[PDB]
Design a protein around this ligand. Sequence first.
Ligand SMILES: c1ncc2nc[nH]c2n1
Ligand SMILES: c1ncc2nc[nH]c2n1
Lengths: 175, 173
Amino acid sequence: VPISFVFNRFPRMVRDLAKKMNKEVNFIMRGEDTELDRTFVEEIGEPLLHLLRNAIDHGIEPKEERIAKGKPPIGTLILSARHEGNNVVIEVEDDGRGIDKEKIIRKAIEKGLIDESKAATLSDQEILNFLFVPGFSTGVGMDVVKNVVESLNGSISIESEKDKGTKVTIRLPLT
Amino acid sequence: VPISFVFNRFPRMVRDLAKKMNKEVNFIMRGEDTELDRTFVEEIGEPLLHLLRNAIDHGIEPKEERIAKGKPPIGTLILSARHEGNNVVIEVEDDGRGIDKEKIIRKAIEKGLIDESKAATLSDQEILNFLFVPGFSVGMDVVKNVVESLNGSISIESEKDKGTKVTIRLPLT
Ligand SMILES: c1ncc2nc[nH]c2n1
Ligand SMILES: c1ncc2nc[nH]c2n1
């Protein structure tokens, strides 16, 4: 199917979540005509909704806070799909507050998953990969998202920078 | 301790290996004045030796093969050290044949570490990380074990026909 069968539900959900969280959001969808196997289309909606909720709740800052930090007042959330080879790549990008990598490390230390000595040389991808540890952040856990994607033989990655925003990328096979 | 205590022994070794294996290698060292804990300088020499050997043996192609592929007949091998905040980053880069990621996936399926259905979407880093699994191909597992013993991290980047970069991050300590 076109992925629009899933993506067409999102403007309403984003607008309802934005209203609930009293938060202003500029929501853009691109690549909605990207086609993929019906199995994927039936299963990818749930993980994507979790990602979009997380971006609206934890990422995008209130307008007053963005203005105070010198950002464009209204936060932007971009959901896109495209073909890459025989795979389909779906991205959810926000220009919010980003993920605090220092906080991740502190939490990882507190949970006994690493010591201070080793945290000093971790890469960015290594740090962000703690988010996929079951119960790490415990509120949509990145573990739960990843478990669905993996059930579709897909892969997920996260990139993020404090004050800049977050991009989550999902790659799915043709199957 | 400056890392030159280690780096200064490598040019002769590289040139000896390259001649042995019939390769023309331009070996470049950068950042040899970079200072870190004497402990690190002592222990990192053996792992670095192995990386440099790997690059000359498996990475840089014989001149005849370089010419046949339309590459410069002289291969380049770069060993560098630099400060990055309170870490030190050491890199070993070659312009050789690159690592075959397809071969890695094939071997991993063969050895039963992963099943075919997952391979279509695996990340680059996830694929290259198989090289650290013991017995997968003095080994890369042992280089990783030494680095990790020093509270460091190691990563591999590669592109077929273009070359390979191995990066080691250590604390200053
Ligand atoms: C925290 N901060 C920002 C985010 N954008 C998506 N997920 C996030 N989690
Ligand atoms: C295989 N091919 C190229 C290489 N360069 C360093 N190590 C390597 N292993």
